[PDB]
Design a protein around this ligand. Structure first.
Ligand SMILES: [K+]
Length: 920
């Protein structure tokens, strides 16, 4: 049967067991595909979707084995035999096809409900590149051929939108644990491997337990598994020590042999120090803080009948976590497919986005899930934070010292534990350490800074606020019922609230409005919203302690917690006054950009590996659709050699933080944070060192680049754009940029290549083909399509500017708008044609929604040597009707290249009427 609707068609395939399939035209280039064994297409209401104003017109043709739906941009074909869908572009060129017979549905019976675990396979060629699907920690730029599980965790963020080099995007509308690649996930070591111990006896590896390097006991183990709290009960009791000094060690040693040949993948999930050798070669060498283990993946080509040695070396403190897990190759018929799997839902439901560019793929995500709210302009200046300022004098003193040193600072952050110890969730202030919070806020504001404060979803059962939420049915009960104690003092019972209902959101915000917003705080730091009820619980317990919610089970809704949670604060803060909202959330999700939510990569560590990993994490985050993203400059948690401030390791501490500070100055939000040692510029290193010189320079350069940066921020809303750009976005025809994991573009102009090795004074940098490049620090010109050894002394990061870039700049400022009516300096990097439409607005309220913004077109014609400043369009409260515009040309080596106050070459008065500036 074929049934036509006003917005698409439903096909009931003739083959036995093939599911009915429905197509809906959302817009000319956006097609919804739903497949449901029952044929009714009933699902829980989508959380990520917003309505779309689109052209839903289409034509139908029915020919033989297929039904064709045609829009102005797409032809979608449906098999009448098995229902499989294939998409072609306007010219009939194939873009993406489902696998015929490529759907899977399996029953899942949990929490009194019935769900389907669903899988869709698509045909995928060897040369397809894939990006997005959230923000992850393997250092993978390209996701092709990789296995990636969406499971909200401290440092691992789920957003189910994927982008392809084949000119499409896919939104997978499911809120449960989800898998790209292998639908099975990671297996215990012996499931598809034969094991031999250190004496060659089959069936186990040899495990040895030690305290302070002294052997305690040895035993055979067929699994390497202390992954979660429930697994720790098997750790040998005589091998445990809780001394403040003392450490523990475990080794596993033996050999593995596979049962089927091919590419095998692995994860060493670990905290504290962990090494792994295969065939004598070191393949994992990692440190994380004991309470935040994560996956460290590797892969090997292996064939049956051949043994390979394995040696795991773990050095830990109580408690720490480890697991060695494995995936064997999929069947050949499946192994090359693009596969998407979800644990719980009602049907397969996804959206095909036709995309002539990577930019258009991101724009389709914003159409489907919401435009990205504008953030306040001050959010794009420098943020200073600490875990934690322990008194209001410490916080205010940090602001005062930035001002005394004339460094640039816009925003200061107050972390957790400002409340009385036994009153988490009251939002009260301990008067010993915060005697006058209203005065704290006023003192910060009087120094022209904004203040953000930590608010968790966490409540102690003794607080009035807990009891209010609980009496209304909006407190998860299990964590308090089992008596789980947190880490504060002697340990406190606690739980987290249920954000899914609008009544819960109203209560949560009302408590915060009365206690905190009334005091003038500017921004909300919405931490731990995975939610992180008790760290390192197994997944069954995380689910049980967050269920039921107002809509259903935490199995159906495992990844969606931050969306309603941040929504409630966004709506309440926006209703309370006319200023723009700012939220920093530890997790994003599909749609969170519509609630004025920036995100960060979580409690990563002060390690060069983690720094490097954030480059590909940030690029994939932007291609997933979330444009306001940051990290802790220098890392969150630190090894003992850094916390104890061992002078032997001070040079590396300073060099890591300096390189990471250079990098942070060129990501969407610029923010210093972390655990002790203190992270303010002068506490990293004193004035006189190259570290201080470097941090001060990039701190001030950021303020001069604000006109450029904020124009990009305007276009995250106006043009559904991004700020951090993968190199493939602007060079989609250069295959060499598809897999490079340590370079990116900061807007259209700046190629950024952070230095991630101790003692490096240079690094290799690949310059994309098709453009020439100007070295920011010197003006030296380099042709595209080459790798160079770029100079990188401790104090400077490799930075190159694309020929034809127009970069609006201003004077160095200690805070946003310090100098009112500042002159604008347009810097033109010559060598090709270019254009840049400068967006400006009041930076403060929602007037831009009603058209209160201006655009000044800037056009550079390389043949003529002419910068055209076009007619201004639009106006806003506080706009400069007449203004000074300086112009500076960089066409090659120049002595003041990269200077904070460089020489200008022309200066004109602009009143909105078009004006031309010639280089000759
Ligand atoms: K507001």
């Amino acid at each position: 049967e074929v049934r036509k609707a006003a917005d698409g068609v439903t096909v009931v395939p003739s083959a036995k067991g093939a599911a009915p399939v429905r197509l809906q035209v959302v817009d000319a280039g956006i097609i919804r595909v739903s497949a449901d064994p029952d044929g009714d297409f009933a699902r829980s209401p989508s959380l990520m979707r917003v309505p779309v104003q689109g052209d839903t017109a289409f034509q139908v043709a029915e020919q033989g084995d297929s039904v064709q739906l045609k829009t102005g941009k797409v032809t979608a074909s449906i098999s009448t035999v098995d229902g499989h869908v294939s998409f072609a572009d306007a010219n009939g060129k194939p873009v993406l096809s489902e696998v015929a017979g490529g759907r899977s549905f399996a029953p899942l019976n949990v929490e009194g409900k019935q769900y389907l675990s669903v899988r869709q396979r698509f045909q995928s060629p060897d040369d397809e590149a894939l990006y997005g699907f959230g923000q992850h920690q393997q250092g993978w730029m390209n996701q092709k051929g990789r296995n990636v599980e969406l499971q909200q965790n401290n440092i691992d963020m789920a957003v189910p939108y994927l982008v392809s080099s084949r000119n499409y995007g896919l939104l997978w509308d499911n809120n449960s644990i989800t898998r790209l690649g292998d639908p099975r996930g990671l297996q215990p070591l012996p499931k598809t491997l034969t094991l031999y111990d250190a004496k060659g006896k089959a069936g186990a590896l040899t495990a040895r337990y030690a305290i302070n390097g002294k052997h305690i006991l040895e035993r055979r183990e067929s699994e390497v598994n202390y992954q979660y709290l429930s697994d720790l009960t098997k750790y040998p009791k005589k091998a445990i020590t809780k001394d403040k000094n003392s450490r523990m060690q475990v080794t596993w040693e033996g050999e593995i042999e596979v049962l089927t040949g091919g590419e095998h993948t692995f994860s060493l999930y670990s905290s504290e120090y962990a090494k792994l050798y295969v065939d004598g070669k070191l393949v994992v060498d990692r440190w994380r803080q004991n309470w935040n283990p994560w996956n460290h993946e590797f892969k090997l080509d292996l064939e049956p009948g051949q043994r390979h040695t394995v040696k795991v070396e773990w050095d830990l403190i109580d408690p720490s976590y480890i697991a060695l897990l494995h995936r064997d190759p999929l069947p050949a018929a499946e192994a090359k497919d693009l596969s998407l799997w979800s644990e719980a839902g009602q049907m397969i439901d996804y959206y095909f986005v036709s995309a002539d560019s990577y930019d258009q793929a991101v724009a389709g995500y914003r159409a489907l899930t919401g435009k990205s709210t504008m953030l306040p302009k001050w959010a794009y200046g420098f943020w200073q934070s600490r875990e934690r300022y322990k008194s209001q004098d410490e916080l205010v003193g940090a602001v005062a010292e930035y001002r005394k040193r004339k460094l640039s600072l816009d925003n200061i952050v107050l972390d957790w534990s400002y409340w009385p110890e036994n009153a988490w969730g009251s939002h009260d202030f301990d008067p010993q350490h915060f005697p006058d919070p209203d005065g704290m806020v006023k003192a910060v504001h009087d120094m022209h800074a904004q203040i953000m404060i930590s608010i968790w979803p966490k409540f102690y059962p003794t607080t009035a606020n807990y009891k209010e939420l609980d009496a209304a049915g909006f407190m998860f009960k299990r964590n308090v019922e089992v008596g789980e104690l947190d880490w504060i003092g002697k340990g406190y019972k606690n739980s987290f609230y249920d954000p899914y209902s609008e009544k819960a959101q109203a209560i949560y915000w009302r408590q915060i409005n009365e206690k905190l917003n009334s005091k003038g705080f500017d921004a909300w730091w919405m931490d731990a919203d995975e939610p992180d009820v008790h760290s390192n619980l197994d997944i069954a317990e995380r689910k049980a302690r967050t269920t039921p919610n107002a809509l259903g089970s935490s199995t159906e809704y495992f990844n969606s917690y931050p969306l309603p949670h941040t929504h409630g604060v966004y709506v309440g803060d926006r209703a309370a006054d006319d200023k723009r909202v700012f939220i920093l959330s530890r997790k994003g999700y599909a749609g969170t950009q519509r609630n004025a939510v920036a995100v960060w990569s979580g409690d990563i560590v002060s390690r060069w590996d983690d720094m490097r990993d954030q480059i590909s994490g940030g690029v994939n985050m932007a291609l997933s659709g979330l444009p306001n993203w940051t990290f802790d400059i220098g890392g969150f948690a630190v090894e003992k050699r850094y916390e104890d401030q061992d002078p032997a390791h001070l040079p590396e501490w300073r060099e890591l933080n300096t390189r990471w500070f250079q990098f942070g100055a060129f990501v969407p939000i610029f923010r210093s944070h972390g655990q002790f040692p203190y992270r303010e510029i002068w506490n990293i290193a004193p004035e006189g060192t190259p570290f201080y010189e470097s941090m001060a320079y990039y701190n001030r350069l950021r303020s001069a680049l604000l006109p450029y940066i904020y124009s990009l921020a305007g276009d995250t809303y106006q043009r559904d754009g991004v700020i951090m750009r993968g190199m493939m976005m602007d060079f989609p025809n250069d295959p060499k940029v598809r897999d490079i994991n340590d370079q990116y573009l900061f807007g259209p102009a700046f190629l950024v290549a952070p230095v991630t090795r101790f003692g490096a004074t240079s690094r290799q940098v690949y310059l994309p083909a098709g453009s020439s490049w100007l070295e920011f620090a010197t003006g030296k010109r380099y042709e595209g399509g080459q790798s160079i050894e770029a100079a990188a002394p401790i104090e400077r990061m490799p930075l190159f500017v694309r020929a034809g870039s127009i970069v609006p700049t201003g004077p160095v400022q200690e805070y946003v708008d310090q100098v009112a009516d500042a002159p604008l300096t347009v810097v033109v990097y010559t060598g090709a044609d270019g254009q840049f439409s400068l967006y400006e607005d009041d930076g403060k309220g929602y007037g831009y929604e009603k058209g209160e913004f201006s655009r000044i077109p800037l056009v550079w014609n390389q043949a003529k040597g002419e910068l055209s400043i076009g007619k201004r369009e639009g106006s806003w409260t506080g706009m400069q009707a007449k203004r000074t515009i300086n112009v500076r040309f960089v066409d090659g080596p120049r002595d003041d290249a990269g200077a904070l106050a460089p020489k200008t070459d022309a200066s004109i008065q602009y009143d909105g009427k078009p004006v031309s500036v010639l280089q000759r």
